Amino acid sequence: LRNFCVFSSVKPLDFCDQYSSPCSSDATVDDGWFVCEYHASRFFKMEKLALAIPDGTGNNYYRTVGKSLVDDKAEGIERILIPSQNNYETVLNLSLLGPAERLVFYMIYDNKEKQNEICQQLRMYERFRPEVVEELYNSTLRVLALTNPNESRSFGLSVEDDLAFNVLPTFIQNLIRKCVAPESLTIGTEDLQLRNANTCRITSEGLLASVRLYNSVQPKYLYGVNENRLQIRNVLQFQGNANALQQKLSRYELYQINIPLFLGKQIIST
Amino acid sequence: LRNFCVFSSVKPLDFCDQYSSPCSSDATVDDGWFVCEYHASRFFKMEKLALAIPDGTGNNYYRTVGKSLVDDKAEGIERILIPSQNNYETVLNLSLLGPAERLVFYMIYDNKEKQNEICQQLRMYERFRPEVVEELYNSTLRVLALTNPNESRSFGLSVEDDLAFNVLPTFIQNLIRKCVAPESLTIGTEDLQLRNANTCRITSEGLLASVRLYNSVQPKYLYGVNENRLQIRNVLQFQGNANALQQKLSRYELYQINIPLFLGKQIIST
Amino acid sequence: LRNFCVFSSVKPLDFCDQYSSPCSSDATVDDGWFVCEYHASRFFKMEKLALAIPDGTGNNYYRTVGKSLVDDKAEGIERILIPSQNNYETVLNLSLLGPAERLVFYMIYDNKEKQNEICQQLRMYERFRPEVVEELYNSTLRVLALTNPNESRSFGLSVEDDLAFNVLPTFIQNLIRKCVAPESLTIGTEDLQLRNANTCRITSEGLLASVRLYNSVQPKYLYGVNENRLQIRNVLQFQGNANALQQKLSRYELYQINIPLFLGKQIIST
């Protein structure tokens, strides 16, 4: 598979002579997400980060991790990173989404009746192109087929988190496992405490950024705004003086205020 | 016999147009082992070594000897070099082995009922090739027929070792006699003390590497590993400095830390 | 997939420099069997036949069908064409079969514990080749993944046959559906009675050739016999006279006495 993004196969179902997939340049690597960074930020509000674990001889074990794009001002449904099968339609706005994306999301969350209904209502578009729904279905199914089942991953200090994670779809479970780093890894015979407190939670609503940590990250895809019209807000302002703002400290190494997803424990022994 | 290995006649019993025997290049010599170095390392975990005894006029009497591939970390069943007829099935994993190798091992250890059962269950494969079991049986029997009975070999300081060696099958007895060198040879009228302590033992379990000697030999056939996946272990590490590691001594003649099989006494008088 | 046979990936797990798959020349077509004719005859005792249904304008719909190689003299277990998950080990002689074929059959019949056990006992063979069990597992799983779920197929006049077919593994179900032709097809709005009586049955033992029909087919792979030794049987004999045997009728078109698998009904409406 040249492109591993599950949404890569989504194309306009009308008679389009040419189309370019909006997947990012990182969609060609098989990191286990099966979603490109652009689609992960657009739908699940996450970006991709690398986590290097050094053994002590030079080799580094790289593990992918999700960086939350949810701001501290966001509340309620805006804090849901990965919606669960209970309320994914409202979180992802499936009704407003196009039929291809809607069908892909239905297959991802394993809603057989909805997939069948969408297919039987998209039969007519087979007139424009004989592969509007067939090849998309085959590609999405073959991409999802790689997510089915030494690692021992627990996603919480209570059985509630584990049972909430268990009932999630297999693709959602794989995405959560790949995007959520452990609070305290257990590699070989030693424990590596990556962080002392959790950053994301797993409940019936799905994977959320429960803690109100400050996010100082500029999204690389969710950055455009309607510059033409006018908006009113009460922002905080500083003077703009180098001595007052201590701008002379900008030459020092910057500690990025990011929100990586850290939750639970992982055990890697082999 | 171009090939003296007892496992050389083992071929896939299905309809195979062509097949190449995995025997090593040394299988063409008649050293008395009747097993190639590859098969000896694969099954009995031994390699072949030559032992030159000089008389004093220039001529050298060469005797084959077994070099143990068992590491010091190996314990229990992993230390069994040549399994005895009591527990050869578990040591060699006969159940997992193919029918041809299983039948060959059954004939080697002289288990008449098992040989008959394997033959009567391999009758059906005669449909694919009319020599799946016939020519294999004849070749293995004719190879084993060379192992039946001035040398006087004792395999221990106690009668227990001798009685344990006696009850072993004739092929196993020949292999042990050829692979185990004497601790102190007695040639002509003089004794040549090859080593002062034994290295291998013979008990009801068979021929084992009882002593926990360090093995610093790289196997020439049991060297492949699963490079694709990941494994975790706590190895010992050095700095990698020439002065610290005394690398300048590498130009000196190297004393190989091998584990040749030395046990008992041999008497050659004629 | 160049080769669609599920047993194509089976290779000797030892250090083999070269190996040629015993799959027939028809293993390259995707007929839905996912087993070559050679392997189907060797294991399931079936050969492949084509069944052309003419619509009336020239186009022919081709459906694959299984031809039984079971003779009328065969009785009991010899009449089992496709063993069910209840007694497949005894029918296919899994214990005598090699570890690769045993693991493939275990994966086909979906016996998770046995697959895990065979894998954990074949770890050691990873020393010889790092893909003895990994690539075989991936290839077999990806071949089986094509068998998972307008056609309406009933495999009997009673609910017992349907429930016996339902409990079978998905690969076995696909093989039975592809190899067993319907007694009376129902295409479009008309019924085409291919045969008036069933030829194969489906019970808890699997798919069997219950009827004692005479088989006058010469197998193209199960034809070799042990010519070297001697066998005794009481065959039927004719004189060998052209007038007595009516050999002059040989120029007429020959009605082949075959045993194609016909059972149940099929409905194709779209």
Q: Comparing C-alpha atoms, which of B78, B83, B119, B127 is closest to residue B102? A: B119
Q: Comparing C-alpha atoms, which of A111, A72, A23, A60 is closest to residue A258? A: A72
The answer to whether B160 touches C255, Cβ cutoff 8 Å, is no
**Distance (Å, whole) CA C20 – CA C15:** 14
Q: Comparing C-alpha atoms, which of C207, C219, C212, C178 is closest to residue C66? A: C178
DSSP states of chain C as a string? -----TTTT---SS--S-------GGGGS--S--S-HHHIIIII-EEEEEEEEE-SSS-EEEEEEEEE---TT--GGGGEEEE-TTSHHHHHTTTTS-HHHHHHHHHHTT-HHHHHHHHHHHGGGGGT-TTSSHHHHHHHHHHHGGG---EEEE--SSHHHHHHHHTS-HHHHHHHHHHSBPSEEEETTEEEES-SS---EEETTEEE--S--------SSTT----SS------------HHHHTGGGGGSPP-----B-B-SEEEE--
B167–chain C nearest CA distance, Å: 29
DSSP A78: G
Please provide the distance, in angstroms rounded to a whole number, between the alpha carbons at the two ends of chain C.
29
Q: Comparing C-alpha atoms, which of A81, A61, A5 is closest to residue A259? A: A81
Q: How far is the CA of C104 from the CAs of B17, C24, C41, in angstroms? A: 22, 18, 17
Strands B201-203 and B60-68: unpaired
Q: What does residue C203 show for φ and ψ, rounded to 5 degrees?
A: -130, -170
Chain centroid offset of residue C43 CA: 7
DSSP B66: E
Between C12, C20, C224, which is nearest B18 by CB? C20
A151–chain B nearest CA distance, Å: 11
Strand partners, C207: C82, C202
| SS3 state of residue A65 | strand
**Distance (Å, whole) CA A51 – CA C112:** 34
Q: Comparing C-alpha atoms, which of C106, C108, C94, C99 is closest to residue C132? A: C99
Please provide the distance, in angstroms rounded to a whole number, between the alpha carbons at the two ends of chain A.
29
**Distance (Å, whole) CA C215 – CA C43:** 18
Q: Does residue A269 sit at the B interface (CB-CB below 8 Å)?
A: yes
- B contact test, residue of A62, A63, A152, A270 with most B CBs within 10 A: A270
Please provide the distance, in angstroms rounded to a whole number, between the alpha carbons at the two ends of chain B.
29
Q: Which amino acid is at B51?
A: L
Residue entry with tokens 């070297």: C228
Half-sphere exposure of B152 (CA within 13 A, CB side): 8
> What sign results for the dihedral spanned by CA atoms A197, A203, A206, A209?
negative
- B38 contacts C126? CB cut-off 8 A: no
Q: Does residue C128 sit at the B interface (CB-CB below 8 Å)?
A: yes
Chain A residues near residue B237 by CB distance under 8 angstroms: 56-57
The answer to whether B264 touches B154, Cβ cutoff 8 Å, is yes
The technique by which this structure was obtained is: cryo-EM
Beta strand ranges found along chain A (DSSP E): 46-54, 60-68, 80-83, 151-154, 184-187, 190-193, 201-203, 206-208, 265-268
Q: Which amino acid is at C162?
A: D
Q: Does residue B114 sit at the C interface (CB-CB below 8 Å)?
A: no
Q: Comparing C-alpha atoms, which of B42, B107, B96, B105 is closest to residue B69? A: B42
The answer to whether C201 touches C161, Cβ cutoff 8 Å, is yes
The answer to whether A123 touches A26, Cβ cutoff 8 Å, is no
**Distance (Å, whole) CA C226 – CA C220:** 16
Return the structure tokens found at A58.
Answer: 């030079």
**Distance (Å, whole) CA C101 – CA C123:** 16
C121–chain B nearest CA distance, Å: 8
- B230 contacts A61? CB cut-off 8 A: yes
Task: Find the angle CA(A187)-CA(A189)-CA(A193) to the nearest 5 degrees.
Answer: 50
- B20 contacts C16? CB cut-off 8 A: yes
Q: Comparing C-alpha atoms, which of A43, A110, A259, A132 is closest to residue A35? A: A43
Where b means 16+ CB within 10 Å and e means fewer, C104-122 reads bbbbbbebeebbeebbeeb
The answer to whether B232 touches A270, Cβ cutoff 8 Å, is yes
Q: How far is the CA of A260 from the CAs of A49, A80, A179, A195, B246, in angstroms? A: 8, 15, 9, 10, 47
Q: Does residue A128 sit at the B interface (CB-CB below 8 Å)?
A: no
**Distance (Å, whole) CA A222 – CA A70:** 11
The answer to whether A156 touches A263, Cβ cutoff 8 Å, is yes
Q: Could you give the angle at which helices B99-108 and B112-122 cross, rounded to 10 degrees? A: 150
Half-sphere exposure of B206 (CA within 13 A, CB side): 26
User: Residue B150: CB partners within 8 Å, gap ≥ 6?
Assistant: B268, B269, B270
> What sign results for the dihedral spanned by CA atoms B187, B192, B196, B197?
negative
What DSSP element (H or E) covers A144? helix A134-144
**Distance (Å, whole) CA B44 – CA B52:** 24
Chain B residues near residue A188 by CB distance under 8 angstroms: 232-234
Task: Find the discontinuities in chain A where C to next N exceeds 2.5 angstroms and give the residue preceding each.
Answer: 149
Between B17, B22, B42, which is nearest C16 by CB? B22
**Distance (Å, whole) CA B29 – CA B237:** 42
Task: Find the angle CA(C250)-CA(C256)-CA(C260) to the nearest 5 degrees.
Answer: 180
| SS3 state of residue A108 | helix
- B16 contacts C20? CB cut-off 8 A: yes
Q: Which segments of chain B does DSSP mark as H helices, in order?
A: 37-39, 88-92, 99-108, 112-122, 134-144, 159-166, 170-179, 242-245
**Distance (Å, whole) CA C137 – CA C146:** 15
**Distance (Å, whole) CA B187 – CA B153:** 12
Q: What does residue B155 show for φ and ψ, rounded to 5 degrees?
A: -105, 30
**Distance (Å, whole) CA A92 – CA A113:** 19
Q: How far is the CA of B141 from the CAs of A138, A220, B43, C26, C38, in angstroms? A: 57, 75, 19, 40, 32
**Helix, strand counts (H, E) of chain A:** 8, 9
Chain centroid offset of residue A104 CA: 15
Interface size B-C, in CB pairs within 8 Å, comes to: 81
A270–chain B nearest CA distance, Å: 5
Q: How far is the CA of C69 from the CAs of C44, C182, C197, C222, in angstroms? A: 9, 19, 19, 9
Q: What are chain A's partners, defined as 3 or more CB pairs within 8 angstroms? A: B
The answer to whether C82 touches C44, Cβ cutoff 8 Å, is yes
| SS3 state of residue A145 | helix
Chain A residues near residue B231 by CB distance under 8 angstroms: 270
**Distance (Å, whole) CA C121 – CA B248:** 45
**Distance (Å, whole) CA C95 – CA C88:** 11
Q: How far is the CA of B198 from the CAs of B41, B62, B156, in angstroms? A: 21, 20, 9
Q: Does residue A268 sit at the B interface (CB-CB below 8 Å)?
A: yes
Strand partners, B201: B208
Q: Comparing C-alpha atoms, which of B19, A168, B3, C141 is closest to residue B11? A: B19
The answer to whether A198 touches A264, Cβ cutoff 8 Å, is yes
**Distance (Å, whole) CA A137 – CA A122:** 12
Q: Does residue C90 sit at the B interface (CB-CB below 8 Å)?
A: no
Return the structure tokens found at B69.
Answer: 């591939």
Q: What does residue C248 show for φ and ψ, rounded to 5 degrees?
A: -65, -15
The answer to whether A184 touches A192, Cβ cutoff 8 Å, is yes
**Distance (Å, whole) CA B208 – CA B63:** 21
Q: Does residue C12 sit at the B interface (CB-CB below 8 Å)?
A: yes
- B231 contacts A270? CB cut-off 8 A: yes
Q: Does residue B253 sit at the C interface (CB-CB below 8 Å)?
A: no
Resolution in A: 3.3
Strand partners, B230: none
- A268 contacts B232? CB cut-off 8 A: yes
Neighbours of B88 (CB within 10 A): 22
Q: Comparing C-alpha atoms, which of B101, B79, B6, B219 is closest to residue C14? A: B101
**Distance (Å, whole) CA B149 – CA B171:** 10
Between B16, B99, B228, which is nearest C130 by CB? B228
Q: Comparing C-alpha atoms, which of A44, C229, A184, C5 is closest to residue B138? A: C229
**Distance (Å, whole) CA A70 – CA A123:** 38
Q: Which amino acid is at C205?
A: E
Residue entry with tokens 């703002």: A245
**Distance (Å, whole) CA A251 – CA B3:** 75
Q: Comparing C-alpha atoms, which of B82, B92, B79 is closest to residue B215? A: B79
Query: Which A residues 14-73 touch B at CB under 8 Å?
Result: 56-57, 61
The answer to whether B179 touches B261, Cβ cutoff 8 Å, is yes
Task: Find the angle CA(A222)-CA(A227)-CA(A233) to the nearest 5 degrees.
Answer: 85
Between C18, C19, C228, which is nearest B130 by CB? C228
Q: Comparing C-alpha atoms, which of C120, C151, C145 is closest to residue C133? A: C120
**Distance (Å, whole) CA B19 – CA A145:** 37
Between B15, B97, B226, which is nearest C130 by CB? B226
